[PDB]
């Protein structure tokens, strides 16, 4: 008989999917534990499968030359995954910013809002009622991303001719799209599912452009 021990430390990238109950690792082995599970900020309410004795958390942890922060370690029956703990709500979101339209016209016709974007040639249809952000699960980052994008765009382009009007307005359009909208004035809980193609919206915009033109002329 002959044994062998090779202590191996590998910096892999883990991945988790909604509802972030467990995360996979680059080595193809699951860890059945929420990435945000911990003790602070009421993180104990997160779902975990391993018993509490196999999980420990360290506050004020500094790495190795191989700004101390918190550390969230674990001992799976095969390995010991370790990742620095982060607050779930600002750490993860269930909606990704798709496009930043500099000028997206909003119009009301037939009891709906027709957000037409001539820049990307795409028209969405949404209800008049503003979609509440509370209805979106883990959607706090949506507000931050939208505000940053609109502030950047306004400073770059619109600060000389137009002004903003109030807080941004959020509407949910057909196909599973959330349109964070900020109206401008010239100086003169559930998870939403999104379609896999914007072909319907592009065709709607093209048909609307052609139809308005031919109808007017």
């Amino acid at each position: 008989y002959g044994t062998t021990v090779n202590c191996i430390v590998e910096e892999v990238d883990a991945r988790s999917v909604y509802p972030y109950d467990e995360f996979v690792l680059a080595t193809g082995d699951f860890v059945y534990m929420s990435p945000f599970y911990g003790y602070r900020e009421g993180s104990h309410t997160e779902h975990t499968t391993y018993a509490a004795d196999r999980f420990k958390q360290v506050d004020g942890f500094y790495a190795r030359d191989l700004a101390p922060t918190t550390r969230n370690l674990l001992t799976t029956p095969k390995f010991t995954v370790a990742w620095d703990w982060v607050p779930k709500r600002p750490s993860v979101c269930t909606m990704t910013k798709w496009q930043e339209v500099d000028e997206m016209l909003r119009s009301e016709y037939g009891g709906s809002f027709r957000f037409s974007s001539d820049a990307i040639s795409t028209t969405f249809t949404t209800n008049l009622t503003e979609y509440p952000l509370s209805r979106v699960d883990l959607g706090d980052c949506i507000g931050k991303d939208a505000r940053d994008a609109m502030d950047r765009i306004f400073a770059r382009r619109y600060n000389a001719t137009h002004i903003k009007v109030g807080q941004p307005q959020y509407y949910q359009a057909n196909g599973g799209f959330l349109i964070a909208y900020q109206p401008l004035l010239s100086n003169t809980v559930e998870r939403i599912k999104t379609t896999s193609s914007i072909e319907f919206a592009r065709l709607q915009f093209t048909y609307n452009h052609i139809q308005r033109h031919v109808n007017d002329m």
Partner: antibody, heavy 124, light 107 residues
Framework: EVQLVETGGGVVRPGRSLRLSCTTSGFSFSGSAMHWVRQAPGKGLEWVAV????????QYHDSVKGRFTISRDNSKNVLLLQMNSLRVDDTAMYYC?????????????????WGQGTMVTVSS | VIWMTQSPPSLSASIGDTVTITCRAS??????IAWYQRRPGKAPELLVYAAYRLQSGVPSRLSGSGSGAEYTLTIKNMQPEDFATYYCQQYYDNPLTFGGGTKVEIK
């Protein structure tokens, strides 16, 4: 001419609720939003509540979570502010501030015309 | 919560003088500030919104400026009807907050 006549203010011992109402003469409901702003003695102004043109959009100040209620009736042009469990810090000059009109249906969070004021105090 | 710092708390200027008042923010609000004044014994009236827009009836001498987290209301050649308290109010986020207030009493 726009006139914000508001009543329902008076001395109330701490512990229970109170009701405030406002009447609009020139300002037309269902066309503009309405706010409630209070001004405690010795301090500056403080935003409390806002109601949309129709009433489907309600936003409250962080200090009136679960304690204040706002409503409007566009038929009689009367704005209702109902507060529950008013504390001593709520002593303030409550004005029925009107949100400025910039677009047909938008709440601008800026007050173009204010009410005269009303005495709302919580003493024991 | 966005914190308003309308400094200085008080000033003094005579008729025809120029005066400036400064409002600071805990974070950038992107021109989403409003300036309010109250004549003694009078209800507040809107003066500036979007930080550089003046409504109908506002004297052209009044003017707002600044960007980001810095916004200053400048009054040039102040008349008798311009000496009153001034309040800077933001509306970028929630809850809405007002400024501390500045006073301009004639010497």
């Amino acid at each position: 001419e726009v006139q914000l006549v508001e009543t329902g203010g008076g001395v109330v011992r701490p512990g229970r609720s109170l009701r405030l109402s406002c009447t609009t003469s020139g300002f037309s409901f269902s066309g503009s939003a309405m706010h409630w702003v209070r001004q405690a003695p010795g301090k500056g102004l403080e935003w409390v509540a806002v109601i949309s043109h129709d009433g489907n959009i309600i936003q409250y100040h962080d200090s009136v979570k679960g304690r204040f209620t706002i409503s409007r009736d566009n038929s009689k042009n009367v704005l209702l502010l109902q507060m529950n469990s008013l504390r001593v810090d709520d002593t303030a000059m409550y004005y029925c501030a009107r949100d400025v009109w910039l677009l047909p249906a938008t709440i601008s969070y800026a007050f173009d015309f204010w009410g005269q004021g009303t005495m709302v105090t919580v003493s024991s | 919560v966005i914190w308003m710092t309308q400094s200085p708390p008080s000033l003094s200027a005579s008729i025809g003088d120029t005066v400036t008042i400064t409002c600071r923010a805990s974070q950038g609000i992107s021109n989403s500030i409003a300036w309010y004044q109250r004549r003694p014994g009078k209800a507040p009236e809107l003066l500036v919104y979007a930080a550089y827009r003046l409504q109908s009836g506002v004297p052209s001498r009044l003017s707002g400026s600044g960007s980001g987290a810095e916004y200053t209301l400048t009054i040039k050649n102040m008349q008798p009807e311009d000496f009153a308290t001034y309040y800077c109010q933001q509306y970028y986020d929630n809850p809405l907050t007002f400024g501390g207030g500045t006073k301009v009493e004639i010497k």
